[PDB]
């Protein structure tokens, strides 16, 4: 007639990326980054086109896109109201991730090179942490973007004041305090493609403070590092087998050698050692056909193999490897594998961090340094 | 997209019933349908009608000609000498498909008059006025007329519409499909002292000009199918719900306080189902009718539910409150997702049954706790795997035979066996739990809200189906709505667990590699059994090592056998630290039984029941004891209890005794540990040291501190030590000595529990505890030592059994003067007399049970007595008792009793196909073939039960014992 | 294949910024004729022509890193591109010291750690290439010379 389940003795007490991001599609998640592409990591230069309308030299008209924005927003609202009116998932194609539609905000970073950084196509949430005032409080100061949550226990290193609302980017990679600023009155946003220039205005720009890392960047030559390289190569090989049209499912080796050119012999073809067999006689010659007993994994199994956040941690590791390599122990402490290990260990309560040090990304007294100190 | 199989579209139907005669069991009425032809040259219109005598039919007030033929009255010809069951199953499927309204067909074929052909070619409205009469219906609408004198309201006579699925053709002519939605107008002219309850809202109630009868007018503006239209006419006591005011509860006279107490919880069920879904209750009223001699225990129609009165309990009745509570809950779940959103075909029934069962399981989770939810899910999964390994498999969503491994056709609901229908609903709600496991619960509730919101925007239009078919769900529409809200499609999961009809069997064994610190699992599947299929997906395994609980995902492809997973340290055995559990807590474990070289404490293959599986894991006995003690999952504690019966070591006795002593364990685990401890105690006789098992524990928990053999006076206010107290002597009576006879220390203990029982002080009744005491007395009976087939008389009775017989005589006679709640002690004493007759103690005479199986008794007494007669005619090979049972199947007033007799005679058959018996004549084959062909033609559940009985007795081929 | 889009910021003089803003928020294709951008083969020089009036432009490097973040529900934000360059209209000259927001001004001089930026290694490659032509090499300590 009651509960009668002794639950207090048995049980004592989210981010959805785009379908191009969870499927690790090449443009957005690169297979190989060279040295000049690792120096320009997250700072991509303005490339000159060889073919297209902008490849011909001369003046080029920019095109306003406000009929396009409101047409796409009205179309997405029709899709949402036709599907029952709830919240929908829209980012299903690469053409959904253009800047030509939707409400764009900008997000500037305080640090030069953060320990973790999102790739194109990945999602993040805005959480407004609001500590109520002692006793009576009016309610969270309302904010245009994000959802509000009442935080008794401060997520960040410091603690919120009573009656202080702090917005923050929250995802699987990090959590970082963001501060809304209005845009300058002179700056517009030009989206250039091969066909022409397009212009939006911006009105909202956030400044992102020092990140609190939630994912540990692996070290170089680590076991997690080599495991991610092997799993990424295996996922790319499976997706090339899925894309193959000729049954018995066959791929070419120099497609994989074009994708992963730093990979040597054994390494790149130890994933072709299993699942594939080198047909070189008669038909399918010089192809790696799929074995007939091998069941090619489904889409959800391939998604469960490698996560996009592991790819971002690997990209952070190899970019920091390049920067350290170019600059000939203080710098090694500022490497993201050390700082991410230090911060995550401090969050479990293993150890403490010297908050003033050399891992400080500001170079002055502002900002923290995530390097381990003993709790003694 | 829904395209009708009918060439017309039905818009509105008026059902008027006059002259409900209770003495003659007769109704008169008419039916007026408003159809729009969709194809020109409509000519014949085919409607559904059974048992109604059609007087006249007028189309647009012009006299029309009809022809009636029902091929399902006599399925095969009388002069065909076929006697195999595959012939009858194909002929019965063809006969049901020939009256199917889901094809274009129907039983009543009306011919459109000639002058209306220019009205039908350019597609204009046709109004068909049939007037009919039910003369004395067999299973159409049930007349319960008691034989007390007085007026029909003074004796308590009532009518209700009984049947399952499309059975509204049995009391008025209609288009009896779930896809023909129309609006309704229902008038019933009943006696002035009676009330007529039906679907819709009651717009008025006018008197007749003599003021001796009154007409109830109902209107249903939400477009429902004909199959969801019901009726209950009787002298009901009306009770408006004091919390929700559109909900009226109707009971039989003198049962108003039971109705007040019983239906006082229902507003919380309404609030739950309207806050997990975000739609309000779609109908404008809700009516719960409690009746006598019900067809099923709970039936749900549009804006109405019909329960039996045997669910009504008072405030002092426990062990019946959760069962009635969950019957109300599943009736409301079917109100949301069986009556508002309806089916598009007979396929896509798994969608509706799965959504109903799944949201009812969510209600059970919130109400009775997650632990009761896990226990319920595990018992449903064990039920399905037992049924699918027993016979073939349940196929949700077949494609039109698709399932030829069984003996009936799955094309229509009225050819299904009743056990297949039950397992169909069970598998549908477990597959919906699997879809929730792949796509999270909030997205699942968003799917259900999107279906309900499409249906409720559809439900307010007036266009005749230009939008009323958005109230019908299909499989493709359900998967498309899932893909709309989530972006993932479930087509591999749908292809494996819906379209394929099988469960999987896992055999696991591990080995710990000490050198490389790995755990080598070995999981092999039995995929060559008749009910099984091969699993190739991922598989979760949970390993509890000394460093904590870790989950691993294994990829089990066809050629896979050995899975190497890594193991952690064993540094919590260097220092004594607490070992962290599956939840956030940590406990002190006694690590003396553990191996020195392995850190792992237990392994669980598929802990979350994420596949439809049967696991056979080979752990060591100390791992099963650690999993019984320190696990924070009730299904793992239950499976460790189930696996400790093979290890009768005293450490397992200590484990189960520590589980039994432990409050803050879930009570249904301790109730299982009682029976496991009884089995282990029976297996380690000539090793057992002290007293019998659980006796000292019973005197420690439930008896006085100063008197060990006097039980404490009954205070049943804890509801967990009440269940444990009433289940512990029942397991304690299974204690077996070296001579194989129950010890006289446990029998004397049970008799002292019976004598010193005082219930004048608790606020709850004692009927279930005393009934379990009779069950414990029946468990102690060992077979008697008859010499030279000596006649069992009173002098050569066992000295043990004379005390038992005196106690059950006292209990049954005191029940004759002071009755229990549902004659629970009558049922227990009849069961115990059958136990004493099954051994050589009481003479094997069925006359007592034949007197308790008469019509005027309570239905629980009737089914207990008929179970005893079925067991007697199995053991004594009685011909006249089998003819008695078959006669009672043919002509009994209560159809639930007929279905139960066929069910019990299928479960405990008098002979199987392998047996040579004296009861395998050509006469019995001819009787059972006549019972399948004719005789059971009026119920659709007796005919499937007769098909099941013929399959159990004679098999799928020609009866062998025949010329 | 897919090529990551390249977004940059265009800064205009304030009156020309007001005319361009009015023409953008209007939304006609009349703006397309009015606003053109010609980037010179230097790579760091241009003309932006507002209403056919030429303005001189420089493509500069920004000290911080900005990221465009799109959203559909204003609760979850997806990163679309990285912005590091600005075509201000009116080498060391092509480096901007200030940031776009008001709190960030001369972030490069005051709020940036001076570990380093970049040049020295391209010169090393050129030096190794010149070294390739050597038979007798002479190198010394050198003092105040």
B340: DSSP letter = I
The label of the residue with tokens 């064993």 reads B570
Structure tokens belonging to residue B642: 């189930």
d(CA B932, CA A339): 79
Instruction: Among A63, A72, A126, A199, pick the best mutation site for testing chain C contact (most C Cβ within 10 A).
Output: A199
Would you call B632 and A10 a contact, using CB atoms and an 8 Å cutoff?
yes
Would you call B583 and A19 a contact, using CB atoms and an 8 Å cutoff?
no
| C73 contact partners, CB below 8 Å, separation of at least 6 | A87
Q: Shortest CB distance from C77 goes to which of A63, A126, A181?
A: A126
Would an 8 Å CB–CB cutoff place A349 in contact with chain C? no
CA dihedral B342, B344, B346, B352 (to 10 degrees): -40
Structure tokens belonging to residue B154: 């003074």
Contact status, residue A206 vs residue A108, Cβ threshold 8 Å? yes
Touching C: which chains, 3+ CB pairs < 8 A? A
Nearest to B415 by CA among B834, B31, B948, B796: B948
Would an 8 Å CB–CB cutoff place C65 in contact with chain A? yes
Would an 8 Å CB–CB cutoff place A363 in contact with chain C? yes
Would you call A205 and C77 a contact, using CB atoms and an 8 Å cutoff?
no
Q: What is the 3-state secondary structure (H, E, C) of chain C?
A: CCCCCEEEEEECCHHHHHHHHHHHHHCCCHHHHHEEEEECCCCCCEEEEECCEEEEEEEEEEEEEEEEEEECCCCEEEEEEEEEEEEEECCCCCECCCCCCCCCCCCCCCCCCCCCCCCHHHHHHHHHHHHCCCCCCCCCCCCCC
Would you call A61 and C21 a contact, using CB atoms and an 8 Å cutoff?
no
Contact status, residue C48 vs residue C10, Cβ threshold 8 Å? yes
B822: DSSP letter = S
Structure tokens belonging to residue B53: 């005598």
DSSP one-letter string for B379-437: HHHHHHHHHHHHSS---SS-------SSSS-SSSGGGS-HHHHHHHHHHHHHHHHHHHH
φ and ψ at residue B29, rounded to 5 degrees:
-170, -175
Structure tokens belonging to residue A320: 């920091």
φ and ψ at residue A167, rounded to 5 degrees:
-80, 155
* Residues of B within an 8 Å Cβ radius of A: 318, 321-322, 368-372, 446, 449-451, 453-454, 481, 484-488, 492, 536, 538, 553, 555, 557-559, 583-585, 632-634, 663-667, 719-720
Structure tokens belonging to residue C91: 């080498």
Experimental method: cryo-EM
Would you call B719 and A88 a contact, using CB atoms and an 8 Å cutoff?
no
d(CA C25, CA A231): 48
Nearest to B368 by CA among B335, B328, B333, B325: B325
d(CA B307, CA B311): 7
Considering only residues 10 to 69 of chain A, which have any Cβ-Cβ distance to chain C shorter than 8 Å?
A: 15-18, 20, 25-28, 42-47, 57-64, 66-67
CA of A182: how far to CAs of A103, A204, B240, B457, C82, in Å?
Answer: 15, 5, 60, 43, 19
Structure tokens belonging to residue A103: 């409400």
Using DSSP, state whether B52 is helix, strand or coil: coil
Question: Reduced to 3 DSSP states, what percent helix, strand and coil does chain B have, rounded to the nearest 5?
Answer: 40, 20, 40
Would an 8 Å CB–CB cutoff place A190 in contact with chain C? yes
* Number of C-beta neighbours around residue B747 at 10 A: 22
Looking at the DSSP bridge assignments, the partners of residue B342 are B472
Nearest to A359 by CA among A374, A339, A340, A344: A339
Do the chains B and A touch each other, judged by at least 3 C-beta pairs below 8 angstroms?
A: yes
Residue B643 CB-half CA count within 13 A: 22
Using DSSP, state whether B266 is helix, strand or coil: helix
Which residue pairs, CB below 8 angstroms and at least 24 apart, start in B489-494?
B490/B435, B490/B438, B490/B439, B492/A298, B492/A300, B492/B537, B493/B434, B493/B435, B493/B438
* Number of C-beta neighbours around residue C38 at 10 A: 15
Using DSSP, state whether B58 is helix, strand or coil: strand
Nearest to B292 by CA among B940, B893, B904: B893
Contact status, residue A276 vs residue A290, Cβ threshold 8 Å? yes
Touching B: which chains, 3+ CB pairs < 8 A? A
Residue of chain B whose alpha carbon sits nearest to that of A2? B368
Using DSSP, state whether B258 is helix, strand or coil: helix
Contact status, residue B199 vs residue B224, Cβ threshold 8 Å? yes
Nearest to B565 by CA among B513, B636, B623, B631: B513
φ and ψ at residue B186, rounded to 5 degrees:
-125, 115
Which residues precede gaps in chain A, with C-N > 2.5 A?
Answer: 13, 328
From chain C, pick out residues whose CB is under 8 angstroms from the CB of A80: none
| B891 contact partners, CB below 8 Å, separation of at least 6 | none
Would you call B371 and A10 a contact, using CB atoms and an 8 Å cutoff?
yes
* Residues of A within an 8 Å Cβ radius of B: 1-13, 16, 19, 83-89, 92, 293, 295, 297-298, 300-301, 304
Nearest to B534 by CA among B495, B479, B491: B495
Distance of CA A257 to the CA centre of its chain: 25
Using DSSP, state whether B744 is helix, strand or coil: helix
Contact status, residue A125 vs residue A169, Cβ threshold 8 Å? yes
Residue of chain A whose alpha carbon sits nearest to that of C22? A201
Contact status, residue B750 vs residue B729, Cβ threshold 8 Å? yes
From chain A, pick out residues whose CB is under 8 angstroms from the CB of C4: 27-28, 44, 120
CA of B321: how far to CAs of B349, B373, B898, in Å?
Answer: 30, 17, 27
Pairing mode of beta strands B472-473, B342-343: parallel
For helices B942-954 and B418-438, the axis angle rounded to 10 degrees is 100
CA of B70: how far to CAs of A2, B97, B130, in Å?
Answer: 52, 11, 18
Would you call B583 and A87 a contact, using CB atoms and an 8 Å cutoff?
no
Nearest to A112 by CA among A328, A357, A336: A336
Distance from CA of A62 to the nearest CA of C (A): 5
B179: DSSP letter = T
* A vs C: CB pairs below 8 A: 244
Contact status, residue A218 vs residue A225, Cβ threshold 8 Å? yes
Using DSSP, state whether B579 is helix, strand or coil: strand
Do the chains B and C touch each other, judged by at least 3 C-beta pairs below 8 angstroms?
A: no
Would you call A187 and C64 a contact, using CB atoms and an 8 Å cutoff?
no
Would you call B666 and A13 a contact, using CB atoms and an 8 Å cutoff?
no
d(CA C90, CA C86): 13
B433 CB-contact burial (10 Å; exposed 0-12 / middle 13-18 / buried 19+): buried
Considering only residues 111 to 140 of chain C, which have any Cβ-Cβ distance to chain A shorter than 8 Å?
A: 111-116, 121
Considering only residues 23 to 52 of chain C, which have any Cβ-Cβ distance to chain A shorter than 8 Å?
A: 23-29, 31-38, 41, 43, 47, 49
End-to-end CA distance of chain C: 58
Would an 8 Å CB–CB cutoff place C59 in contact with chain A? yes
B610 CB-contact burial (10 Å; exposed 0-12 / middle 13-18 / buried 19+): middle
CA of B329: how far to CAs of B269, B313, B335, B773, B874, in Å?
Answer: 6, 16, 10, 31, 39
* Number of C-beta neighbours around residue B575 at 10 A: 6
φ and ψ at residue A63, rounded to 5 degrees:
-120, 125
From chain B, pick out residues whose CB is under 8 angstroms from the CB of A83: 450, 481, 484-485
Instruction: Among C71, C104, C116, pick the best mutation site for testing chain A contact (most A Cβ within 10 A).
Output: C71
Do the chains C and A touch each other, judged by at least 3 C-beta pairs below 8 angstroms?
A: yes
Instruction: Among B442, B478, B485, B723, pick the best mutation site for testing chain A contact (most A Cβ within 10 A).
Output: B485
End-to-end CA distance of chain A: 54
Would you call B492 and A87 a contact, using CB atoms and an 8 Å cutoff?
no
Q: What is the 3-state secondary structure (H, E, C) of chain A?
A: CCCCCCHHHHCCCCCCCCHHHHCCCCCCCCCCCCHHHHHCCCCCCCCCCCCCCCCCCCCEEEEECCHHHHHHHHHHHHHHHHCCCCCCCCCCCHHHHCCCCCEEEEEEECCCCCCCCCCCCCEEEEEEEECCCCCCCCCCCCCCCCEEECCCCCCCCCCCCCCCEEEEEECCCEEEEEEEEECCCCEEEEEECCCCEEEEECCEEEEECCCEECCCCCCCCCHHHHHHHHHHHHHHHHHHHHCCCCCCCEECHHHHHHHCCCCCCHHHHCCCCCCEEEECCCCCCCEEEECCCCCCCCHHHHHHHCCHHHHHHHHHHHHHHHHHHHCCCHHHHCCHHHHHHHHHHHHHCCCEECCCCCCCCCCCCCCCCCCEECCC
From chain A, pick out residues whose CB is under 8 angstroms from the CB of B670: none
Contact status, residue B871 vs residue B846, Cβ threshold 8 Å? no
Contact status, residue B617 vs residue B603, Cβ threshold 8 Å? yes
What's the longest Cα–Cα distance across chain A? Answer: 83
Would you call C2 and A362 a contact, using CB atoms and an 8 Å cutoff?
no
d(CA A196, CA B75): 76
Nearest to A306 by CA among A318, A295, A297: A297
DSSP one-letter string for B183-219: EEEEEEEEETT-EEEESSEEEEEEEPTTSSEEEEEEE
Would an 8 Å CB–CB cutoff place A362 in contact with chain C? yes
Q: Shortest CB distance from C14 goes to which of A16, A186, A190?
A: A186
Contact status, residue A332 vs residue A362, Cβ threshold 8 Å? no
Touching A: which chains, 3+ CB pairs < 8 A? B, C
d(CA B586, CA B792): 61
Would you call A12 and B583 a contact, using CB atoms and an 8 Å cutoff?
yes
Would you call C4 and A193 a contact, using CB atoms and an 8 Å cutoff?
no
Contact status, residue B853 vs residue B866, Cβ threshold 8 Å? yes
Would you call C31 and A109 a contact, using CB atoms and an 8 Å cutoff?
no
B743: DSSP letter = P
């Amino acid at each position: 007639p009651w509960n009668l389940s002794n639950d207090e003795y048995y049980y004592p007490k989210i981010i959805q990326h785009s379908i191009p991001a969870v499927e690790l599609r090449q443009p957005f998640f690169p297979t190989h980054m060279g040295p000049i592409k690792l120096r320009q990591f997250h700072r991509p230069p303005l490339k000159k086109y060889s073919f297209g309308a902008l490849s011909q030299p001369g003046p080029h008209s920019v095109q306003p896109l406000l009929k396009h924005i409101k047409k796409k927003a009205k179309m997405r609202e029709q899709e949402r109201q036709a599907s029952g009116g709830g919240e929908m998932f829209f980012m299903r194609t690469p053409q959904d991730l253009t800047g030509k539609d939707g409400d764009l905000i900008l997000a500037e970073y305080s640090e030069e090179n953060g320990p973790l950084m999102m790739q194109v196509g990945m999602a993040t949430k805005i959480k407004n942490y609001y500590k109520r005032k002692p006793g009576k409080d009016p309610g969270a100061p309302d904010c245009k973007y994000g959802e509000t949550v009442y935080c008794h226990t401060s997520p960040f290193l410091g603690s919120l004041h009573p009656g202080q609302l702090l917005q923050a980017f929250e995802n699987n990679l990090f959590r970082a305090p963001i501060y809304l600023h209005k845009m300058p009155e002179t700056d517009f946003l030009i989206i250039r493609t091969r066909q022409g220039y397009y212009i939006r205005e911006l009105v909202d720009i956030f400044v992102v403070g020092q990140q609190c890392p939630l994912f540990e960047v692996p070290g170089p030559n680590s076991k997690r590092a080599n495991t991610h390289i092997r799993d990424f190569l295996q996922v790319f090989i499976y997706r090339l087998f899925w894309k193959s049209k000729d049954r018995p499912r066959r791929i070419r080796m120099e497609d994989i050698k074009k994708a992963f050119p730093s990979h040597s012999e054994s390494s790149i073809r130890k994933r072709l050692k299993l699942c594939a067999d080198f047909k070189r006689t008669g038909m399918d010659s010089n192809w790696w056909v799929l074995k007939s007993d091998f069941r090619l994994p489904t889409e959800e199994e391939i998604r469960a193999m490698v996560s996009p956040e592991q790819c971002c941690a690997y990209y952070s590791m190899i970019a920091a490897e390049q920067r350290l390599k170019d600059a000939g122990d203080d710098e090694v402490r500022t490497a993201p594998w050390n700082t991410t290990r230090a911060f995550i260990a401090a969050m479990k309560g293993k150890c403490l961090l010297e908050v003033t040090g050399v891992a400080d990304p500001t170079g002055c007294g502002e900002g923290f340094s995530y390097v381990k100190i003993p709790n003694k | 997209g829904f395209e009708s199989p009918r060439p017309y579209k039905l818009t509105h139907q008026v059902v008027c019933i006059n002259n409900i005669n209770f003495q003659r069991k007769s109704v008169v009425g008419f039916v007026e349908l408003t159809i729009f032809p969709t194809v020109a040259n409509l000519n014949r219109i085919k409607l559904n009608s059974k048992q109604c005598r059609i007087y006249r039919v007028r189309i647009n007030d012009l006299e029309a000609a009809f022809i009636y033929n029902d091929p399902t009255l006599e399925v095969c010809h009388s002069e065909s000498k076929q006697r195999n069951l595959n012939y009858f199953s194909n002929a019965y499927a063809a006969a049901v498909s020939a009256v199917d309204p889901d094809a274009g067909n129907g039983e009543l074929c009306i011919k459109v008059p000639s002058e209306l052909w220019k009205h039908v070619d350019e597609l204009k409205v046709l109004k068909i006025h049939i007037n009919f009469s039910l003369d004395q219906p067999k299973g159409g609408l049930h007349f319960v007329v008691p034989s007390v004198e007085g007026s029909m309201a003074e004796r308590g006579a009532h009518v209700f519409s009984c049947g399952y699925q499309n059975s509204t053709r049995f009391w008025f002519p209609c288009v009896d499909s779930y896809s023909e939605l129309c609006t309704w107008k229902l008038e019933f002219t009943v006696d002035a002292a009676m009330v007529a309850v039906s679907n819709g809202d009651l717009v008025e109630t006018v008197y007749t000009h003599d003021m001796r009868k009154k007409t109830f007018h109902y209107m249903l503006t939400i477009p429902t199918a004909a199959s969801n239209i019901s009726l209950a006419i009787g002298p009901f006591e009306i009770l408006v719900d004091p919390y929700m005011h559109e909900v009226t509860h109707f009971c039989l006279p003198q049962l108003l306080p039971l109705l007040k107490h019983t239906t006082s919880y229902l507003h919380e069920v309404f609030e739950f189902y309207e806050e997990i879904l975000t739609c309000r209750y779609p109908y404008s009223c809700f009516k719960t009718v409690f009746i006598d001699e019900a067809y099923v225990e709970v039936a749900a129609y549009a804006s109405m539910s019909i329960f039996s009165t045997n669910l009504l309990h008072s405030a002092m009745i426990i062990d019946e409150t959760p069962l009635t509570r969950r019957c109300l809950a599943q009736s409301l779940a079917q109100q949301f997702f069986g009556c508002f959103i309806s089916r598009m075909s007979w396929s896509d029934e798994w969608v509706l049954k799965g959504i109903s069962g799944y949201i009812y399981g969510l209600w059970m989770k919130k109400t009775f706790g997650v632990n009761e939810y896990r226990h319920w899910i595990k018992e449903e999964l064990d039920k399905i795997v037992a049924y699918e390994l027993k016979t073939g498999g349940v196929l949700l969503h077949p494609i039109f035979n698709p399932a030829s491994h069984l003996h009936f056709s799955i094309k229509h609901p009225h050819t299904l066996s009743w056990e297949y229908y039950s397992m169909f609903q069970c598998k549908a709600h477990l597959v919906m739990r699997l879809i929730e496991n792949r796509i999270s619960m909030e997205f699942m509730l968003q799917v259900f809200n999107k279906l309900l919101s499409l249906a409720s925007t559809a439900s307010s239009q007036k266009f005749q189906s230009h939008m009323w078919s958005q109230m019908l769900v299909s499989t493709s529409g359900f998967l498309k709505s899932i893909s709309n809200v989530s972006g993932k499609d479930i087509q591999p999961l749908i292809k494996q667990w819906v379209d394929q009809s099988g469960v999987v069997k896992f055999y696991g064994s591990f080995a710990f590699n000490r050198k490389r610190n790995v755990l080598e699992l070995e999981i092999k599947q039995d995929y060559t059994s008749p009910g099984t299929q091969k699993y190739v997906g991922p598989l979760k395994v949970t390993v509890q090592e000394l460093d904590g609980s870790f989950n691993h995902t294994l990829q089990i492809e066809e050629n896979s056998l050995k899975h190497d997973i890594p193991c952690h340290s064993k540094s919590r055995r260097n220092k004594k630290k607490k070992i962290p559990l599956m939840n956030g807590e940590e406990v002190d474990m006694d690590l003396s039984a553990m191996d020195a070289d392995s850190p792992l404490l237990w392994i669980r293959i598929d802990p979350d029941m994420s596949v439809l599986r049967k696991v056979e894991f080979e752990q060591a006995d100390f791992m099963w004891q650690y999993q019984l003690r320190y696990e924070r999952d009730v299904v793992a504690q239950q499976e460790s209890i189930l696996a400790l019966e093979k290890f009768p070591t005293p450490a397992s006795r200590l484990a189960l005794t520590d589980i039994l002593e432990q409050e803050q364990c879930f009570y249904r685990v301790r109730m299982s540990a009682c029976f496991c401890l009884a089995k282990i105690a029976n297996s380690m006789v000539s090793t057992w040291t002290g007293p019998p098992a659980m006796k000292s524990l019973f005197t420690r928990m439930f008896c006085c501190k100063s008197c060990p053999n006097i039980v404490k006076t009954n205070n049943f206010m804890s509801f967990q030590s009440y269940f444990l107290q009433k289940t512990m002597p029942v397991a304690m009576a299974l204690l077996r000595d070296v001579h194989n006879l129950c010890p006289k220390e446990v029998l004397t203990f049970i008799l002292d529990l019976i004598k010193y029982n005082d219930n004048r002080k608790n606020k709850f009744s004692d009927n279930y505890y005393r009934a379990e005491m009779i069950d414990a007395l029946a468990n102690s009976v060992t077979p008697a030592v008859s010499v030279n087939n000596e006649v069992r008389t009173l002098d050569n009775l066992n000295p043990d059994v004379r005390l038992i017989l005196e106690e059950i005589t006292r209990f049954l006679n005191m029940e004759k003067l002071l009755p229990s709640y549902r004659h629970t002690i009558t049922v227990s004493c009849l069961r115990a007399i059958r136990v004493l007759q099954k051994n050589g103690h009481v003479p094997s005479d069925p006359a007592l049970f034949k007197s308790y199986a008469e019509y005027g008794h309570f239905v629980d007494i009737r089914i207990a007595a008929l179970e005893a007669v079925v067991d007697y005619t199995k053991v004594d090979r009685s011909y006249e008792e089998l003819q008695w049972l078959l006669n009672m199947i043919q002509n009994d007033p209560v159809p639930y009793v007929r279905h139960k007799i066929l069910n019990m005679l299928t479960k405990n058959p008098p002979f199987t196909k392998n047996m040579e018996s004296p009861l395998c004549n050509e006469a019995l084959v001819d009787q059972l073939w006549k019972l399948m062909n004719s005789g059971t033609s009026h119920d659709w559940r007796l005919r499937c039960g007769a098909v099941d009985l013929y399959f159990t007795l004679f098999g799928l081929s020609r009866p062998s014992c025949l010329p | 294949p897919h090529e990551l889009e390249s977004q940059f910021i265009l800064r205009l003089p304030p009156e020309y910024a007001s005319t361009v803003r009015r023409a953008v928020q209007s939304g006609h294709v009349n703006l397309k004729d009015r606003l053109t951008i010609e980037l010179h083969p230097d790579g760091r020089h241009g003309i932006v022509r507002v209403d056919r009036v030429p303005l001189a432009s420089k493509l500069v490097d920004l000290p911080c890193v900005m990221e465009s973040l799109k959203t559909i529900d204003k609760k979850t934000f997806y990163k679309t591109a990285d912005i590091c360059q600005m075509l201000v209209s009116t080498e060391k000259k092509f480096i901007w010291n200030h940031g776009i927001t008001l709190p960030l001004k001369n972030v490069r001089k005051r709020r940036f750690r001076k570990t380093a930026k970049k040049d020295v290694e391209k010169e090393v490659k050129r030096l190794l290439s010149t070294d390739a032509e050597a038979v007798s090499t002479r190198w010394e300590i050198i003092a105040e010379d």
